[PDB]
Ligand binder design. Structure first.
Ligand SMILES: [Mg+2]
Ligand SMILES: [Mg+2]
Ligand SMILES: [Mg+2]
Ligand SMILES: [Mg+2]
Ligand SMILES: [Mg+2]
Ligand SMILES: [Mg+2]
Ligand SMILES: [Mg+2]
Ligand SMILES: [Mg+2]
Ligand SMILES: [Mg+2]
Ligand SMILES: [Mg+2]
Ligand SMILES: [Mg+2]
Ligand SMILES: [Mg+2]
Ligand SMILES: [Mg+2]
Ligand SMILES: [Mg+2]
Ligand SMILES: [Mg+2]
Ligand SMILES: [Mg+2]
Ligand SMILES: [Mg+2]
Ligand SMILES: [Mg+2]
Ligand SMILES: [Mg+2]
Ligand SMILES: [Mg+2]
Ligand SMILES: [Mg+2]
Ligand SMILES: [Mg+2]
Ligand SMILES: [Mg+2]
Ligand SMILES: [Mg+2]
Ligand SMILES: [Mg+2]
Ligand SMILES: [Mg+2]
Ligand SMILES: [Mg+2]
Ligand SMILES: [Mg+2]
Ligand SMILES: [Mg+2]
Ligand SMILES: [Mg+2]
Ligand SMILES: [Mg+2]
Ligand SMILES: [Mg+2]
Ligand SMILES: [Mg+2]
Ligand SMILES: [Mg+2]
Ligand SMILES: [Mg+2]
Ligand SMILES: [Mg+2]
Ligand SMILES: [Mg+2]
Ligand SMILES: [Mg+2]
Ligand SMILES: [Mg+2]
Ligand SMILES: [Mg+2]
Ligand SMILES: [Mg+2]
Ligand SMILES: [Mg+2]
Ligand SMILES: [Mg+2]
Ligand SMILES: [Mg+2]
Ligand SMILES: [Mg+2]
Ligand SMILES: [Mg+2]
Ligand SMILES: [Mg+2]
Ligand SMILES: [Mg+2]
Ligand SMILES: [Mg+2]
Ligand SMILES: [Mg+2]
Ligand SMILES: [Mg+2]
Ligand SMILES: [Mg+2]
Ligand SMILES: [Mg+2]
Ligand SMILES: [Mg+2]
Ligand SMILES: [Mg+2]
Lengths: 67, 60, 259, 143, 178
RNA sequence: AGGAUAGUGGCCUACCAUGGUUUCAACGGGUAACGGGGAAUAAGGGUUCGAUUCCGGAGAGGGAGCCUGAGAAACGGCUACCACAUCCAAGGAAGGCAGCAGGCGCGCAAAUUACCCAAUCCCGACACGGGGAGGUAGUGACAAUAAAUAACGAUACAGGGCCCUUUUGGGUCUUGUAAUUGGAAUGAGUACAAUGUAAAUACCUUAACGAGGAACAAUUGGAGGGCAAGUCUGGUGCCAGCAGCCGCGGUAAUUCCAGCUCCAAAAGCGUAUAUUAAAGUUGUUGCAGUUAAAAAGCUCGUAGUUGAACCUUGGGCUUGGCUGG
């Protein structure tokens, strides 16, 4: 078999100049947990319809729905 | 020109052809083996008839 | 087309970068800078494709953001900075100094130079004219503006840049017998002496250049860079091969003997 | 002097004369006139779908004597009506009125073939199923 | 998008489909070299048909022409390298005289049978296809692999093959293990 | 001369002249016309194609007009009109997939409403964010490469090959037949696992499993000629049908429908259409014009094409590089 290898002068140096996925392979880091790309994009576009703080936007939306 | 005619005889011959099943014959070899079979049949055991050579001689 | 282009298709990149077809759809678009787009070399190609220090484009940005890379004695963090002819690249972490000089095959050679030679550079004078308040200045090939030049310096001459103060140490007048490297055309990278300058008013002046092997070729004046006061006296160290172009049969014979 | 100019500066006369005379080639006229685009029932296409209007039957040419069993098809793309031969023993029974049939040429490139008069197309599929598959009992007609 | 990847066809069919002389020559030629089909004969003829075209263009040039000297010698050297052209026929006139049997001699299938490792030429192909033959220290399972002169001496059974010091195969292990 | 423009310019205005293009084809019309790099075929010369991986141009339903900005007459910006078209509490409001995927329609004709910024690059105030640009997989017989569907023995029986030999009878080693008999070999597949990757799939490696009718069963077209391969058997009987063309079918059909056998190409084979060669049937190379198609009824004649010969030759002296030998 043929591959590629890196050896750093220290573990601290290795943790700085390495991709995240390789550190997760070796157990030196935890896989970051995030929503799917669809959810992140939909949330970003949903926040685009709000001007100002979310607290103001939902309180004003709540006032309109007198229910 | 004049164009018409009865359509009742469509498929006459094929319909009345007596059905005959294919005998469950041995498979023929595939690929390189079939070329091996043909080469010998034409250049190793020649079946010529003193200058009369036939691939598919009918029985006569 | 509504504005400046910002992308570079892989197939449309300059051929001397020697990029492969299938590594991706796009190629590094050199930034605006001292050197023209077609005649430059982005630092991403140098650190990853040439030196192979970086394995990918993410790593070359990591190298430059730690302040390691210096061009002409100044730290540069632009990964697509258009480094060009005669530029000095310094990596004091690896203790290496490079000069960008064309090799005879038409590409930018990996030409290591000493630290003593890395303290200056040469620039081809494009124009001499008067600035505001009647102050003369010189524009070199890398966009440098040097004020108060020697009044004998004219266009097509070569100046020696102090490269730390930006001043002119001394110069070489453009004349017959000067050592020259060709910086454009199909004779790019060849080194020889000027034999004859042929003038054409309203057109392009042509220069006849003789190789060290007494081979003669003609190239445009815009592709002529004076690098020495005479034959065998270059002002910078030349890359391996000394800019002498060999035929393919000669190269095949040389390769057979070497191996 | 062979009846054509030979001078070195007579290329325009030579170019125009050849251009004028290729119009005598009927194959050339059809390519530039776009006759397939304008006059052909298929509009230059290799195939065309249509709806079966009626089963009729065409009398063969001399010295042959037979009933060539065709159908009348109205093309979907342009509404034109053409006659299409139904090949093989008994494939007319696979074709019913108001079925969707895929047509193709007879292979003589706009002329009638053999003793079939005035027919330039053949039926390839009916109801989206190949007529050959139906004939060899590989598939069944969806009905 | 990404740059296109080049590809090209490696064969060409005859212009006349039915010709007893060509059909008999091909079958006689296929039987001798244990070929699977006629396409393996078309492939040799295709690359030989374009070798002749290259040789004709150089032969029209004057002798001592730089292109003729460089590319002609390289083509001869390449043909000598794979053993198709003899060491005493480096003249570019014997190149035109080459024949398809010269190319079929240098296939891996031909050399395995001709080195005595197999009883017949058809045994050679199945030995190759079944990962038994190795050239150097690399297993090669392509029957059309063109053997170079320096690779000729290194054709033998794979070190991990049952016939070359490896373990027993699937069938033997099932019988002797009961 | 001015105005306007970033700037030249009838770009526009005022005044003034009568000019400008054209048979060397202007102008107009058509284009199943974006241009080019290029593609197919190709002895040479050519013919056909180029919507489409790169470059330039143009457009964002059709027009027109603009704001911001260095840069847009931008459309995943605005304004207005036209055609479509959405919600409505009937007062009003909001649109632009020739972006990715997807739907309808159109059709002979073309795939998933998937994953990701890990690679390639781009953008930003930026080492960090974003990117249906892009990459990965899905569908995918568009094309392209390599390449399985069996191999080898043992007996039998035949012939040749030889040898002991006069043939006889044998010894015996090369082929062919074996519902006539074995033990070997392997990947298609599956799979622990490792590799692969951002994560996977697949590929590559590889334990265990995985081939006798080795049912792990090759097909597509043909068998009169062209054109390779049946005067076999049954059925029909100018019917049904075949047949690119010539032709076949009326009771032993070499051509139909079938069975057997055989031929061609084979993971490919057939059909339709276009195109190229064959086509020296567009002919410059390179056609033909008495009778097969084709010299205007006859002269003149402009453009076009084409146009007799003739002006430092010979001699002499040195002169370098090459190449027989
Ligand atoms: Mg927000
Ligand atoms: Mg917001
Ligand atoms: Mg600059
Ligand atoms: Mg600089
Ligand atoms: Mg044509
Ligand atoms: Mg009618
Ligand atoms: Mg249909
Ligand atoms: Mg034959
Ligand atoms: Mg003016
Ligand atoms: Mg102006
Ligand atoms: Mg076109
Ligand atoms: Mg158009
Ligand atoms: Mg194009
Ligand atoms: Mg185009
Ligand atoms: Mg179009
Ligand atoms: Mg395409
Ligand atoms: Mg484009
Ligand atoms: Mg639209
Ligand atoms: Mg802006
Ligand atoms: Mg635009
Ligand atoms: Mg836009
Ligand atoms: Mg707009
Ligand atoms: Mg849009
Ligand atoms: Mg879409
Ligand atoms: Mg399709
Ligand atoms: Mg779909
Ligand atoms: Mg990225
Ligand atoms: Mg995409
Ligand atoms: Mg990939
Ligand atoms: Mg199979
Ligand atoms: Mg599997
Ligand atoms: Mg698997
Ligand atoms: Mg993994
Ligand atoms: Mg068949
Ligand atoms: Mg035939
Ligand atoms: Mg025949
Ligand atoms: Mg007969
Ligand atoms: Mg014919
Ligand atoms: Mg009978
Ligand atoms: Mg009979
Ligand atoms: Mg009969
Ligand atoms: Mg016969
Ligand atoms: Mg026939
Ligand atoms: Mg038959
Ligand atoms: Mg075959
Ligand atoms: Mg031709
Ligand atoms: Mg020809
Ligand atoms: Mg003719
Ligand atoms: Mg003629
Ligand atoms: Mg004639
Ligand atoms: Mg003729
Ligand atoms: Mg007459
Ligand atoms: Mg007359
Ligand atoms: Mg008359
Ligand atoms: Mg004259």
């Amino acid at each position: 078999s043929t591959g590629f290898g890196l050896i750093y002068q220290s573990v601290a140096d290795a943790k700085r100049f390495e991709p995240a996925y390789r550190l997760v392979r070796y157990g030196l880091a935890e896989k970051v947990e995030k929503a799917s790309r669809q959810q992140r994009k939909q949330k970003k576009n949903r926040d685009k319809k709000i001007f100002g703080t979310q607290r103001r936007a939902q309180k004003r939306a709540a006032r309109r729905n007198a229910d | 020109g004049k164009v018409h005619g009865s359509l009742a005889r469509a498929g006459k011959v094929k319909s009345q052809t007596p059905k005959v099943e294919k005998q469950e014959k041995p498979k023929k070899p595939q690929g390189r083996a079939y070329m091996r079979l043909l080469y010998t049949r034409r250049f190793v055991n020649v079946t010529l008839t003193n200058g009369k050579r036939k691939m598919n001689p009918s029985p006569a | 087309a509504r504005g400046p282009k910002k992308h570079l298709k892989r197939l449309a990149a300059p051929s001397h970068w020697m990029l492969d077809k299938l590594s991706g759809t796009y190629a590094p678009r050199p930034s605006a800078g001292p050197h023209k787009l077609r005649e430059s070399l982005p630092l991403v190609v140098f650190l990853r494709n040439r030196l192979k220090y970086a394995l990918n484009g993410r790593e070359v940005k990591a190298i430059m953001m730690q302040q390691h890379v210096q061009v002409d004695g100044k730290v540069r963090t632009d990964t697509t900075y258009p480094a060009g002819f005669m530029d000095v690249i310094t990596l004091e972490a690896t203790n290496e100094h490079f000069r960008l000089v064309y090799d005879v095959k038409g590409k930018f050679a990996v030409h290591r130079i000493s630290a003593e030679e890395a303290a200056y550079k040469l620039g081809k004078v494009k124009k001499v004219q008067l600035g505001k308040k009647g102050v003369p200045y010189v524009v070199t090939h890398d966009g440098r503006t040097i004020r108060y030049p020697d009044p004998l310096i004219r266009a097509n001459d070569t100046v020696k840049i102090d490269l730390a103060t930006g001043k002119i140490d001394d110069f070489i007048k453009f004349d017959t017998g000067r050592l020259v490297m060709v910086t454009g055309g199909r004779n790019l990278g060849r080194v020889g002496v000027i034999v004859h300058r042929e003038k054409h008013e309203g057109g392009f002046d042509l220069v006849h250049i003789k190789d060290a092997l007494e081979n003669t070729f003609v190239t445009r004046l815009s592709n002529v860079f004076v690098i020495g006061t005479e034959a065998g006296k270059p002002w910078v160290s030349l890359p391996k091969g000394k800019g002498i172009k060999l035929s393919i049969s000669e190269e095949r014979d040389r390769r057979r003997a070497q191996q | 002097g062979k009846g054509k100019p030979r001078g070195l500066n007579s290329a325009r006369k030579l170019r125009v004369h050849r251009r004028n005379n290729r119009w005598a080639d009927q194959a050339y006229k059809a390519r530039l006139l776009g006759t397939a685009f304008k006059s052909s029932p298929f509009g230059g296409s290799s195939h065309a779908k249509g709806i079966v209007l009626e089963k009729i039957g065409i009398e063969s040419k001399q010295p042959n004597s037979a009933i060539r069993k065709c159908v009348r098809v109205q093309l979907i793309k342009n509404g034109k009506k053409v006659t299409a031969f139904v090949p093989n023993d008994g494939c007319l029974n696979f074709v019913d009125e108001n079925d969707e049939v895929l047509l193709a040429g007879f292979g003589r490139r706009g002329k009638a073939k053999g003793d079939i008069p005035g027919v330039r197309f053949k039926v390839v599929k009916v109801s989206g199923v190949s007529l050959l598959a139906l004939w060899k009992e590989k598939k069944e007609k969806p009905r | 998008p990404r740059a296109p990847r080049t590809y090209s066809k490696t064969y060409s069919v005859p212009k006349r489909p039915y010709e007893s002389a060509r059909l008999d020559a091909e079958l006689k030629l296929a039987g001798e070299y244990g070929l699977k089909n006629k396409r393996e004969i078309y492939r040799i003829g295709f690359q030989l048909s374009k070798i002749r075209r290259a040789a004709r263009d150089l032969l029209t040039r004057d002798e001592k022409d730089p292109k003729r000297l460089f590319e002609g010698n390289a083509l001869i050297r390449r043909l000598v390298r794979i053993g198709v052209l003899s060491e005493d026929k480096m003249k570019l006139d014997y190149v035109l005289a080459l024949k398809p049997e010269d190319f079929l001699e240098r296939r891996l299938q031909t050399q395995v049978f001709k080195l005595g490792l197999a009883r017949s030429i058809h045994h050679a192909r199945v030995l190759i296809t079944q990962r038994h033959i190795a050239v150097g220290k690399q297993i090669v399972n392509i029957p059309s692999f063109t053997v170079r002169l320096d690779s000729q001496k290194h054709i033998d059974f794979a070190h991990n093959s049952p016939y070359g010091g490896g373990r027993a195969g699937r069938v033997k292990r099932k019988n002797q293990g009961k």
